Amino acid sequence: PNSPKDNTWIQAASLTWLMDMSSLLYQLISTRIPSFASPNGLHMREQTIDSNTGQIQIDNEHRLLRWDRRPPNDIFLNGFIPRVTNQNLSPVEDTHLLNYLRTNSPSIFVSTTRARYNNLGLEITPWTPHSANNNIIYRYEIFAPGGIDINASFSRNPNEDEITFPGGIRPEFIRSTYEYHNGEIVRIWINPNFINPSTLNDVSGPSNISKVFWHENHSEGNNMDSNQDFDMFAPNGEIPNNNLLNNNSLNVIQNSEYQIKNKKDRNIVVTLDSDYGGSPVESYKNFGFENQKWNIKYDSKKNAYKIYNRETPTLLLSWNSNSSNGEQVIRGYTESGSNNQYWTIEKNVNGFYKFRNLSDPSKILDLKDGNTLNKTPLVVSSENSSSSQEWLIEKTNYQTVKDGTYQVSSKLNENKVIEQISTNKVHIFSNSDKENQVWNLIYNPILKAYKIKSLKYPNYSLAWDSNNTRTIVAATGDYNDQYWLIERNEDNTYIIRNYENRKIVLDLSNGSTTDGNGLLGFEFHGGINQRWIIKPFSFNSIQDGIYQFMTVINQDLIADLTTNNYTIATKTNNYSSNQKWTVTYNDKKRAYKIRNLQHAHLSLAWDSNHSDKIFGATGDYDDQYWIPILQTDGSFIFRNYKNPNKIFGTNGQPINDIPLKAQDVTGQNNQKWYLRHLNSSNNFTGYFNISSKKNFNKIITMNSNKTQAVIFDNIGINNQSWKLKYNDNKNAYQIHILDNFLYFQGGHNIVATMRNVTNDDLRSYWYVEYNFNKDGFIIRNAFDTSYVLDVFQGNFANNTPIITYQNYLNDNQLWNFIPSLG
DSSP, X not given: OOSOSSGGGGTTOSSGGXXXXXXXXXXXXXXXXXXXXXXXXXXXXXXXXXXXXXXBOOSSTTOEEEEESSOHHHHHHHOBOOSOOOSSOOTTTTTOHHHHHHHOOSOSEEEEEEOEXXXXXXXXXXXXXXXXXXXXXXXXXXXXXXXXXXXHHOOOOOOTTEEEEETOBOGGGEEEEEEEETTEEEEEEEOTTSSSTTSGXXXXXOTTSOEEEOOTTXXXXXXXXXXXXXXXSGGGEEOOOOOBOOOOXXXXXOSXXXXXXXXXXXXXXXXXXXXXXXXXXXXXXXOOOGGGOEEEEEETTTTEEEEEESSSTTOEEEEOTTOSTTOOXXXXXXXOSOGGGOEEEEEOTTSOEEEEESSSTTOEEEEGGGOXXXXXXXXXXXXXXXGGGOEEEEEOOOOOSOSEXXXXXXXXXXXXXXXXXXXXXXXXXXXXXXXXGOEEEEEETTTTEEEEEESSOTTOEEEEOTTTTOBEEEESSOOGGGEEEEEEOTTSOEEEEESSSTXXXXXXXXXXXXTTOBEEEEEOOOOGGGEEEOOBOOSOOXXXXXXXXXXXXXXXXXXXXXXXXXXEEEEXXXXXXXXXXXXXXXXXXXXXXXXXXXXXTEEEEEOXXXXXXXXXXXXXXXXXXXXXXXXXXXXXXXXXXXXXXXXXXOSSSOOTTEEOEEEEOOOOGGGOEEEEESSSSOOOOEEEEEEETTEEEEEEEEOTTSSBEEEEEOOOOGGGOEEEEEETTTTEEEEEETTEEEEOOOTTSBOEEESSOOTTOGGGEEEEEEETTXXXXXXXXXXXXXXXXXXXXXXXXXXXXXXXXXOOOOXXXXXXXXXXXX
């Protein structure tokens, strides 16, 4: 209990797989944090999201900034990716929040700092890096859900405004960045793909500094010098003053392609009926047609705007103020030189823009009688507190998703995913993470559109059989019906709209999520059956290296290559070659061979042709490749590459020497493994107070004579600050204080402290293993691995000896590791 109420705190996560692992992530961050350092636990940011709308709050209160030396060409497309990205997370370092803050050690954490303001709301110098005045630094603006308030979470003498995001932050929460050259701002960058495309003209800075909208591979997009988190580290900055930064020196609309959407019906947008002169400007449901978009160009002298149709560039949004019949209808006309083709655009208190003509500014841009009904002409009319004359001016945004592999799924059931069965057909199916169930989105910069190509058949792409069916197919070649516009919605879903006929979007037939149901190209109405969940997916979930596969139910049991035939069963861990596995990715199979360490020529295999045996097969087969899938509780499930519905587990509860069985996936715990990445770099270094789970204030302490180890009140003495010396060969540590080593004396026996230990003595070595179920580290001996450090009898009186005893996962057997001094 006591973790966050919901995902909110990590919803920004750049590491998207992390978003629905709150409980686990709280646990991991917290074990390393000792009671004293956080009296009331991590405080999460309140208010970041709205509760009348659910959308990200874009006020001063929750404005954040990140100082980064990385350019937009990188950042606006990648967001803030933590220094650590691996799916198999560790509480030792990966998540060690306190250590990252105190060290800037690699971690999954990305920090930011609040913007500062005075009592009157005016912006004041933020926390600022000492290096800031030198070379090329970027100061990113951020509005993101979640984050952790460092200040309200801790007690450690620092940036009182640091706000850390576990998982990083996707670029759609980065709204803008200042680019600095030696202290001087040279350019303000706007991110078109920011989450609220309509607050983009609220970004301010000084005057005579040019605002620019960023695209991928901008000419001026990647200015930079010759870790990434260096500049956002607390002792690399401070608050220099309370000086007023230069701001609010425009409040205009930057030139770019926009859609003017009406406040009465945001589904309806200002449209130019036709290509010729004097053709009316009407309102019509937004289908993202070229004529539903306009190039707004601003004129300094006049402080007014010309609004050019995108579809027909030389036709301007205009009011023929010179017409007879005192007309009040808006039409498209060529540049006549007159002010009746100019508009002043004013932002009302509530965020919306009004459009008044220049030639007569009492004439305002409006829908006819407020009729939102399609084809009703844009008129100009006197001022009303009517909603029809209020408009959103939204910046068009095409590159909505990064390139790479995604698993497209219906909002109706996010388990039901787009699958390419055989080569040309595509249907909806219950997901089981297979290649033909995963798609590769590649944006075309010139088309502003994506090709959605399968992983299983690269020569094919999700297309539209415009010639016949009007069903959804796959096809070779590079035709426009194979290109898709992808529009992010308010509920994070996407409309997948065809490029050829922009009427046609990706529809799940009838709304039927029934296994096999077809996909039409159907006319856009935006129902839930046209909304899709594009979700990043990645076959190389883990890194290559040597592993152990612990069972979720019993972590002391691992996948062990037995001697009885060639079988693999769960057996008590002993750190033997044959219990270790070299796991290696296969570009081509998009899965993993799990080759034994002792007997490399044997790989973890399923006797697919014969039984549900798991054994060490020689050579190579599809049934020897595995797809690890991260589970919300930190464990993995390994789907077999031949029948991905089969995963290796234990038929029920795992005890010593019971064989692994292939089974139909069921989610049960007997199917899930925690991976010990033995090869890894998540090891303890330096000094620690090793306190007990059962009493966080009672810590392993060397007695006066330096003969034994005992439990003791934490009193800050040298016999409590223990050095952990890791040994790469043994995957074990020596835990010592000077020449005095923590030392096995047998099970049931008091743990000695020995001077003079030879380097290979396993009696001086200890495995420190995090238990996920108990949330506490086990300190297990290396000489005889049946025994772990145990506060004798569960008695916490000062001087009770530490003994080694079989592991029962009792509270007196579990341990925390909190940094100290030597």
